[PDB]
């Protein structure tokens, strides 16, 4: 899904062009988030690539290749 803007109670304190909270989109891919979290888990390794394996309504599933 989208990236809900992490502001308290939806208040942004500025112009109406920046009042958006809900329909905002993260500029990186869910696959990129997956690789970042896996690399943080195994910081001794190096991320080579990744690929989609499955999805449902809540989760997307990736397999990450790493090299020691």
């Amino acid at each position: 899904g989208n990236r809900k803007r992490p502001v308290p109670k939806g208040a942004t304190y500025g112009k109406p062009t920046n009042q958006g909270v809900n329909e905002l989109k993260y500029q990186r891919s869910l696959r990129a988030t997956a690789e970042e979290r896996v690399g943080r888990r195994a910081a001794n390794l190096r991320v080579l690539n990744s690929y989609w394996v499955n999805q449902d309504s809540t989760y997307k599933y990736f397999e990450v290749i790493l090299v020691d």
Binding site: K15, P16, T17, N18, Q19, G20
Partner: protein, 103 residues
């Protein structure tokens, strides 16, 4: 005002080039199309966050609009336009005035 349904006037249709008979109707504006460039640009500007992005007129002052006669040449179907002065009431049906009659 009362304007007749026919009028003999000049026709610049490249085959008439003279006074011919014309049918007179009232001009109506016509439906504002999508895919006109201004409408496309306006919809693009309106989409997303930021609210209303163009002015919306409020301080109306006229009580009339100018009437445009659209004239159809009966020979070559060439159309002409002419605008009249401001009038509160307009009629094309010709009920001519009569002078020496009762009220």
């Amino acid at each position: 005002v009362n304007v007749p349904k026919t009028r003999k006037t000049y026709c610049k249709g490249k085959t008439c080039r003279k006074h011919t008979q014309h049918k007179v109707t009232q001009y109506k504006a016509g439906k504002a199309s999508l895919f006109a460039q201004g409408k496309r640009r306006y919809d693009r500007k309106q989409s997303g966050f930021g609210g209303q992005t163009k002015p919306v007129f409020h301080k109306k002052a006229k009580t009339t609009k100018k009437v445009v006669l659209r004239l159809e040449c009966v020979k070559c179907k060439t159309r002409a336009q002419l605008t009249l002065k401001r009038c509160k009431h307009f009629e094309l049906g010709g009920e001519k005035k009569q002078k020496g009659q009762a009220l």
